[PDB]
């Protein structure tokens, strides 16, 4: 029941500030340090700092302290990281994580906020079905798709049948074209399932707080 | 300054062998090392605390060891569900903490052929733009294929936007989605687009095509 | 005269070859054993952390940091050290036992500063220090103990820390 909840995304304009939130639940808030960890797209983890809720004691890696401020609201068991004067170098995923007392390991990690620094506007995606159309199979398997194109910024969440289709799924990493993101997801079922059983991709774009379903039809 | 070094960047085993990741500190730090596992698009998961202490819900095949400078996270009988990046973390310099650069664990099986599929556009046509020809080439070995596109006697290397992929718990078979996109008035021009390939090492590729209607 | 008379071993718990043995952290002429992150209570009972100091050069400052009882809540509840007069009194191997001995009589020319750095050179202040002489003729080994194995926090137990100072002939 231990939980560290983080918003999916924050789109920040260059030079603006951003407030990141980390809602804790299911444990004693005042007994844990709350750390902040930065991970740039395809790279490693980078520790930023930590804060203790009781005394507001903060410790930073002095390389990034100039831009970071850590904050806690004990009333709502929420940890905040303020970031100022953002640049493209500041775009990354920012996890919060907890550590008990002086045991300096991170047992419970948050979901992570994907932070994007750009002047481009938020754009919800267009979800287009991908059906075989004619090309089937006598006793083979049918592969169905879901094209999620033209959105900004990352991330996008794609499930099939609200999550009931876990296997045979291949969600491919988004590609940046013309400052817009395009993503495709693939599912695979035997021919006796589709079109007989209705499969639907659920696309959630947290940056725009937009959700769309798209049934795959012949 | 205490510096951590993880070598190598990529480690490859076989489903059932013994894997071991190295974390070296630039100075002796006792047993102040902690290990984590981060799967694709996932949050890091604590595997081992203080060099060799097991965590509450971690499988017993995860073991760490070491004191001073050289630390090793080992996996006896490795499954494919263990595919992820492994970071070490030092706490000797508390209240300042740092992570190693991470070591990626991949698995290589025997072989595998990609299940290729070509696709037309759907309600994107009614919108106005269009011209999205996505081609899935799912489940294959080794790590890289070589998809290609055709026209009416030649090739268009224009809006081919490819996307590779990580591993899988059951397949360990990579995947790729080449989505060659053009304009919705030019897609109504050639009308015989083929999605060629070239994955695997055998001669003669795998071709998937379609026609306007 | 007299300066105490006790008798310990490397343990007083369990384990003898499962000891986590590591070298001190040497920065220039400062050789440091820091136990502030090695002795916290842990599930696998009482571990033994043995920090080995190897002195092969003149005028090396050996510094030893022991986490103070109550410095953090709970984790060091029953922490005690080996020689109470740790800078001036050390432990020496006598077959299988460790007994107390004056350090100045063990190594001639030991420069024990009474003020470590604005504090009393004693494990009561968390840190002890001593500088080795410019010349040592015979290899000399003495020991220190920072024992947190009595501290119980949760379902795990603290660790026993050992410093082995091996002064080589230089």
Residue numbers in the entry:
A (entry chain C): 1 to 218
B (entry chain B): 1 to 213
C (entry chain A): 561 to 730
Authors' text:
The complex of Pfs230D1M with the Fab produced from rh4F12 was crystallized and the structure of the complex was determined by molecular replacement. This revealed the structure of the Pfs230D1 molecule as a sandwich of two beta-sheets. Pfs230D1 residues 561–730 were visible in the electron density. Not visible were nineteen N-terminal and six C-terminal residues of Pfs230D1 that were present in the recombinant protein and are presumably disordered. The light chain contacts Pfs230D1 residues K581, Y582, A583, S584, Q585, and N586 in the first beta-strand and residue D594 in the second beta-strand in the sequence. There are light chain contacts to the loop between the second and third beta-strands at T596, D597, Q598, K600, T602, E603, S604, and K607. The light chain also contacts the third beta-strand at K609. The shape and make-up of Pfs230D1 has similarity with the domains of Pf12, Pf41, and Pf48/45 of the 6-cysteine family, although Pfs230D1 has four cysteines instead of six. The two disulfide bonds of Pfs230D1 are Cys593-Cys611 (C1-C2) and Cys626-Cys706 (C3-C6) confirming those first determined in MacDonald et al..
